[PDB]
Amino acid sequence: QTDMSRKAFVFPKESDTSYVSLKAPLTKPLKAFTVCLHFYTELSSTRGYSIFSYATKRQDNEILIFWSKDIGYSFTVGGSEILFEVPEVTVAPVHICTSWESASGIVEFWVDGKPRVRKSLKKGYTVGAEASIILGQEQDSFGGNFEGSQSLVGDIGNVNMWDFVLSPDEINTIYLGGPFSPNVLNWRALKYEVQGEVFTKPQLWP
Amino acid sequence: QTDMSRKAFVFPKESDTSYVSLKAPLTKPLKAFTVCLHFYTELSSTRGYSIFSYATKRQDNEILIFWSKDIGYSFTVGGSEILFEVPEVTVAPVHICTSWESASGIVEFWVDGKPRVRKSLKKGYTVGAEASIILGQEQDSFGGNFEGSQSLVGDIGNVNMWDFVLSPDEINTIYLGGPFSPNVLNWRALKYEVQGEVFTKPQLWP
Amino acid sequence: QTDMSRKAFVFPKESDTSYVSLKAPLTKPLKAFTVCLHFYTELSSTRGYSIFSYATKRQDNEILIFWSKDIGYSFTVGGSEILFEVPEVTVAPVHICTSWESASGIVEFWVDGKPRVRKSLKKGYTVGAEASIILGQEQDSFGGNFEGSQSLVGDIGNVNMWDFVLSPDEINTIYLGGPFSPNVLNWRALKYEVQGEVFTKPQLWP
Amino acid sequence: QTDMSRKAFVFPKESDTSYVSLKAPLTKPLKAFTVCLHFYTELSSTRGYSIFSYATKRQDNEILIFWSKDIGYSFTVGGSEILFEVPEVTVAPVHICTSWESASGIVEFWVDGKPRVRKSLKKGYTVGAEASIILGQEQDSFGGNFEGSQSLVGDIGNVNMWDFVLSPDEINTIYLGGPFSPNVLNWRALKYEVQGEVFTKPQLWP
Amino acid sequence: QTDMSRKAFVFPKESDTSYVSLKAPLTKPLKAFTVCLHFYTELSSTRGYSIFSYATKRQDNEILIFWSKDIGYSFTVGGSEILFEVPEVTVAPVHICTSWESASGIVEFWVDGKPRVRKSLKKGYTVGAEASIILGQEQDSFGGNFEGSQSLVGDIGNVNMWDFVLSPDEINTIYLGGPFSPNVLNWRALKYEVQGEVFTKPQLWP
Amino acid sequence: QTDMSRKAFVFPKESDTSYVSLKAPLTKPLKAFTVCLHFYTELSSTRGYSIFSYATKRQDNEILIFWSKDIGYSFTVGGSEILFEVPEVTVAPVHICTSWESASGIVEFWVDGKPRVRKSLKKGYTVGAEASIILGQEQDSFGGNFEGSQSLVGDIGNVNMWDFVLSPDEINTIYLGGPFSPNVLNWRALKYEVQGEVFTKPQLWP
Amino acid sequence: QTDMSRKAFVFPKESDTSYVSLKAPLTKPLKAFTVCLHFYTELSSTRGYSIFSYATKRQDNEILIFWSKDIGYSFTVGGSEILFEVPEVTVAPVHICTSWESASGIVEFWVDGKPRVRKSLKKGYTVGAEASIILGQEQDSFGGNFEGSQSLVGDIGNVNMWDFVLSPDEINTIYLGGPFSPNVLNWRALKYEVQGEVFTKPQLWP
Amino acid sequence: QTDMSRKAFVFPKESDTSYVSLKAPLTKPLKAFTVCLHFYTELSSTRGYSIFSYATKRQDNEILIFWSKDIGYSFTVGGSEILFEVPEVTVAPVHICTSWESASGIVEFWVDGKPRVRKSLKKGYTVGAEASIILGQEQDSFGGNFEGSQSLVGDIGNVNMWDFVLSPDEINTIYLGGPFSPNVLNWRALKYEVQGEVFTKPQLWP
């Protein structure tokens, strides 16, 4: 396990071969989750890119956080999709947290500490446990079939995941940088593989 | 009575059947009132929605707070109506307080602690005590005939009602949060009934 | 003498019958004055309205502070007008102070504590002491003949009048609500008479 | 109400006359509370001092937060006391939060975002709502009988009070300076009287 | 079961009455185990206290983790005891994991993710499955004869037990927080009885 | 001398007769200078106007600071000119400092304490000492031939001149109002003669 | 070595002759560098200009920091280019730090303390140490063939160079102006040669 | 004046003759001030020494900052003293800022960016304008009677003085070396006279 604190993955060119694969010894299917991360890219005005892609063999888009050009964030679970439209986009590092709960289907989406309106997605679904989590690319098969037009170029880091919906009070602590313990995917205790050109560099964001 | 402090009702899908009904111990009819609430919705740029509907068996719009698209707040009492123009809207939780006095008909409208100009509405009228108070829907009959196109989608909370006009100083403490005690309808001690797809969640707004 | 502190006159409808008359204890003709006030109205984009109207039996616009649509503050003395043009008007309570001095004709206009450029008007003129001072209406005779399309709608208050030019240091303490001692017309000890639909309410501006 | 944000009360002399009294127009007796405040003094090695004194007519020490020489924090409700021993102290501003709940009697003490062990005090008690809240002095009758040897010297500020136990996640947000809404006593909306040599100055702490 | 996630048991007073009893589904006898728990108490300087007490009808100290004053952690299995001396102790929540393997008698002790030196205890022994597990008290019969001077005061939580020796890589995830699945006793699927004055509260530690 | 501190000249009407003439106790020819003055006018969107016109018997624009409509500050020395283009003009008092040095021809221009980029003008020139210095008008002979279209309207004050280039730190104190000693032209010890409609009033700018 | 602290080179006219040649003591070829400098010019809306031109006998654009009109910053290493496109620019002094590392080819660009997204350029290349470093011109042979249309007009200063990538926290202190020790090119110990019309003046920026 | 930036006065031997006298352009008697300086000395364990000595012909200790052995900083105004005790001292360059305000008598003392607790001294006094400011010695008459046992040995510099209390966030910029413009005594525009064995050297500290 590597402590990536103060470090970010740098994807400095467009390619369909640069990715990092994050490992979770998760054994229970997810009835809820939260995923929080920082990314920095200047693509947002040019084209869409995958921020965070979770794939199971039944479903390449089992959790996907995606930027869609001139729309905003695409959040999708179980292949189904909801949009958080973002008309003004400004070139700065952006922190997001997103939570999903099966029992209500409520999606919470938070950007730089501000909540988006709660929306409904995939109520009653369950996210599979045997999953391939990939950064820098969008999976169209379990761990593969990357599309270069969907790769992230720039920085991603502080990638933390919980198998429960964080309350707003917790997320305020996360964004302010108070202490927290992610129970699914821990940036302080991260197991990952790097493929192609990806670099580990000092994070540009505070 | 239930203490709903720091909780909000979530209306995550459009429907004509998701609503909550609030019970007021209101025996005397109202010569004046104040109602304050937080709501959060994406709809303001898409369509109108009912924020707060108070109906009496003789009058379906006995008090109604309505967002009307490309206009702003429609505030109506006894079926008569006045508008508070809002040309531009930002995606954030919004707190409103509204008060009406029969003896003058003066309406105060407050948004995020800013007063709108006082206006005259239904001077000398008297609001009926026997009322069906509903969140999430627009009612065209006592407790029913909802229109799905008028439903609220998003969050509503801290719904407090006084049978008297709050002073500006009091309204400021409602907004900033200091101590107060509503006497018609009280979020700390609410009686409510929930129908359809409605959830109680931690409030997004501080 | 009524201490109107923290209170304001509310004109909640357009009419040509609602007004209040303020009884200056003046007997010397004014060689100079300052009038300062708070008002709040939505008309500024709809139509012109009288703010403060001072008339004498020879001259109905002996002092007039007037908002003229798409222009700004019309300020008249002795029936002659200068414009303090206002390109963008935004709906908030607005404090003004206006000062005139016969010995030079200089008009000072101050809006929310910022000076407009000094402009000359009516050098050598004299303002009659036997004056009907009216709020809420524009008057075209001594005490009447108001026009509804020139009436004020919304709030007016803190009307203070001095028979001398306040220096900028003093006008600053007026805007900040420091102590001051008006010697022509004192809001903290006002003689007034109300006619038609006018209400005394808590002031909305802090 | 005054927005005291970014400002602190300075008590720059030892005295029995300097105090500020904080008004909390509170309806129900408190079954629970949280009081958070930031303060700075060098007295800690010289003598004890009152930090926050809440009295009712029955009980001069109905809530008291007190530094006790060589012991540390003294926390008392209803005149019964517990100690949070502090063996080593530094001259720095210290932020504290203290929560009490009647239902369990559990006291949470938090210093600079670190929790002290939960302790039991006054289970089943009920703190009176009609209270005199004093800063700068310890009080022994409802509004008075101060002791100069128990006065605070230095700075006190960010005094916020809630009528409920904040969760740990909330308190983290407070200490990090996240957004929050105190519902009893609110630094952004403080109504207070100053007596004696007390000054409002920019806060020394961030 | 109960999901106790983010909750701790609070024992806010010294007594022999307050305890919780935890039920393992354990029917195989233990040839090895790991127990991990997070606790917080101020007793460490005042007196010894029981952290975790596993008893069988034949042996009341079948597994016991005990803090002994001015000595440190006492780990005993089958009545044989070894110590991990702790010369200096600071009041902060402490996480420990202990592992014992019969096939070698090796004891692993981990404090806040730092390993102690491996020690040998009870090689070849076998721990009985017919067990009573108690938190808050030390027990000397199968479920009682508690001693007030040995009771825990403060908080214990995240009590997880495995019938096998966790690897150091695993124990790092337990400390930092990543995914794991205990099979003897699972905090996220806990069966327990509360007895006496015990409260469930938000865990103070992240 | 007259100490004009806290006072400004008021030019309240457009004319070709209102001016003040300033006297320099100067006989050495200027190899360099700084001129600083604060002015306030609304003309800037209507037409150009002279800010500071310095003439010698050989050259009517020997130093001229001139606002030119839709361009900005014309600065001219010895009749040669450069422009400091200004794309957006607020109606507020504006403070300028301009400095010229013969040895390099560098012009510094500073507006409200922000420097313009340095530019080159009249390298190797020298300004005559026997000069007529006029505020309010743009002179085309040694003392006259004014033009109404070029007059200033509004206020001008704090006119200070040095026969050396002030450094940036020095200019910062001028803008902030630190101590300085103007050795060519001193507002605190000014010699001036007034002609026509010109008044001395309290400065509007703080 | 001249300590140029708080001084800037001024290039007040367009020319192909005004330049400053800076000499590094550098013997080992650069595997990485940081160049950061502070400059001020109005040309940005009018034409491109060279900010920092580093050449070697094989390569006239060995390092170039260039402003390209209506595009933004051009950063070139070894004659390959990447663009940090700037949508909008204003007349203010701009501080930039840039860094390049051979091993990864990552380029960092920082403007006024804001990082640009990290980009890739000339991975595996190496910059020659036998270098001519010229401010004021863009050079097309080792120390000459300056294109007048590429000259900088305005100010440049604080030119500091390191043979390594500064971390983000270092670069922050540079922009703050904390302690730093450039080891290739030190403004506080600058070896430089002026040619043509160039002046050294007090720096305009703080 | 001289720009003393990056340079310090060195008093490398004990004497009663080496001093520098600083000339304030101070026009007016001080109702408040701030003084900030860097000094470095090994005397702190051996004996007291004067850091900054301000005298008027009435008063030899009109402002004095003085290290007193085994105690800390004596700060005195008008000859009355307050102590900021410093129990442990470390041999490193020391930056202090001290502030006093007559209207409250509040003294602020800041060492290396840490505020001391605010204290009261000489409320209602006013510091005289005709003053001898001396570094290196303590003066007991207007310009003289130095005591060798009170001389500073070591370095003093960055001596900046304001006639107003700097805000705490200003003092951060002073300590950080952000921009500032002292208006009583400016190290970047110092007027001084050097007496005896005193040298100007590059400052040892950053």
Ligand SMILES: C[N+](C)(C)CCOP(=O)(O)O
């Ligand atoms: C853009 N998107 C997130 C809807 C789809 C991503 O690509 P794909 O998974 O449909 O192939």
Ligand SMILES: C[N+](C)(C)CCOP(=O)(O)O
């Ligand atoms: C207020 N409003 C007219 C916009 C909506 C009222 O809806 P309804 O009550 O007429 O169905």
Ligand SMILES: C[N+](C)(C)CCOP(=O)(O)O
């Ligand atoms: C609107 N106005 C103030 C410019 C002119 C008003 O003229 P009148 O209506 O008082 O006769």
Ligand SMILES: C[N+](C)(C)CCOP(=O)(O)O
């Ligand atoms: C409890 N205490 C003794 C530490 C503080 C209060 O003292 P007192 O209010 O009884 O005078």
Ligand SMILES: C[N+](C)(C)CCOP(=O)(O)O
């Ligand atoms: C001493 N000890 C606490 C480590 C073990 C014995 O305690 P006990 O079970 O005999 O009461």
Ligand SMILES: C[N+](C)(C)CCOP(=O)(O)O
């Ligand atoms: C060109 N100018 C408008 C800046 C100045 C004109 O001066 P003048 O030619 O009118 O005397």
Ligand SMILES: C[N+](C)(C)CCOP(=O)(O)O
């Ligand atoms: C074109 N450019 C801006 C990248 C480089 C300019 O220098 P050059 O290519 O003219 O020598």
Ligand SMILES: C[N+](C)(C)CCOP(=O)(O)O
């Ligand atoms: C307090 N002190 C010791 C620094 C000074 C006392 O008076 P003096 O030494 O300036 O004469």
Ligand SMILES: [Ca+2]
């Ligand atoms: Ca896919």
Ligand SMILES: [Ca+2]
């Ligand atoms: Ca794809």
Ligand SMILES: [Ca+2]
């Ligand atoms: Ca309807």
Ligand SMILES: [Ca+2]
């Ligand atoms: Ca209806």
Ligand SMILES: [Ca+2]
């Ligand atoms: Ca009229």
Ligand SMILES: [Ca+2]
């Ligand atoms: Ca009229």
Ligand SMILES: [Ca+2]
């Ligand atoms: Ca008491």
Ligand SMILES: [Ca+2]
């Ligand atoms: Ca007492």
